[PDB]
């Protein structure tokens, strides 16, 4: 498996609807679960693993056997509260990378579980941090686009030493630049 980095364009891509709710959804679960563990993250979108699909596991423990794995498949986002608090994030996507991201306390969700069950809930906290976090990552959306002028700049140079490696793998430009911004 392969966490996919900034600035492949698999992390801006559309993710599609879940419609199968079956033995490899689960299979997949567990492996996105497993490169959380093991990569010391709390959360991990599909897309972050290549696939471009509407899949988000979380755990707000972020350590085994604590907290509670949490699986959400075709979530939409119903109410954002109105009180932002900031939090320092990083992301798999963006190794090494820190900064501040201003966010709302709490969210409303729909979604559904693992088995296809359809459930609404309320998300505060850390939860609702991590979700929010991983929901922009099903929209195409990262996290140095939340970010004020002010903390970009001061990541700017260790975005374009992402937008290197991937020109220097690929042998393309980098298909996105934090400099246009
Ligand atoms: C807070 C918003 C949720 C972040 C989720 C990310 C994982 C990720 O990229 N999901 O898409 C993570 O685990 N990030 C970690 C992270 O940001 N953490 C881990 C503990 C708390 C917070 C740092 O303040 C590390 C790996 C950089
Ligand atoms: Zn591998
Ligand atoms: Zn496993
Ligand atoms: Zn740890
Ligand atoms: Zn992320």
């Known amino acids: 498996m392969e966490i996919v980095e900034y600035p492949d364009p698999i992390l801006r891509a559309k993710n599609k609807?879940?419609?199968?709710?079956?033995?490899?959804?689960?299979?997949?679960?567990?492996?996105?679960?497993?490169?959380?563990y093991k990569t010391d993250g709390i959360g991990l979108s599909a897309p972050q693993v290549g696939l471009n699909v509407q899949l988000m596991v979380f755990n707000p423990a972020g350590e085994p056997g604590?907290?509670?794995?949490?699986?959400?498949?075709?979530?939409?986002?119903?109410?954002?509260?109105?009180?932002?608090?900031?939090?320092?994030?990083?992301?798999?996507?963006?190794?090494?990378?820190?900064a501040?991201?201003?966010?709302?306390?709490?969210?409303?969700?729909?979604?559904?579980?693992?088995?296809?069950?359809?459930?609404?809930?309320?998300?505060?906290?850390?939860?609702?941090?991590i979700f929010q976090h991983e929901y922009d990552?099903?929209?195409?959306v990262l996290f140095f686009d939340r970010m004020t002028d002010?903390?970009?700049?001061?990541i700017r140079e260790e975005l374009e030493a992402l937008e290197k490696k991937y020109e220097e793998k690929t042998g393309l430009p980098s298909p996105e630049r934090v400099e246009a911004r």
């Open 17 to 36: 609807r879940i419609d199968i709710f079956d033995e490899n959804l689960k299979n997949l679960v567990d492996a996105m679960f497993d490169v959380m």
């Open 66 to 98: 604590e907290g509670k794995e949490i699986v959400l498949v075709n979530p939409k986002i119903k109410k954002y509260s109105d009180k932002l608090v900031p939090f320092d994030e990083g992301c798999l996507s963006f190794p090494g990378i820190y």
């Open 100 to 129: 501040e991201v201003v966010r709302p306390q709490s969210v409303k969700i729909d979604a559904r579980d693992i088995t296809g069950e359809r459930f609404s809930i309320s998300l505060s906290r850390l939860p609702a941090r």
């Open 137 to 140: 990552h099903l929209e195409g």
């Open 150 to 154: 002010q903390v970009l700049d001061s």
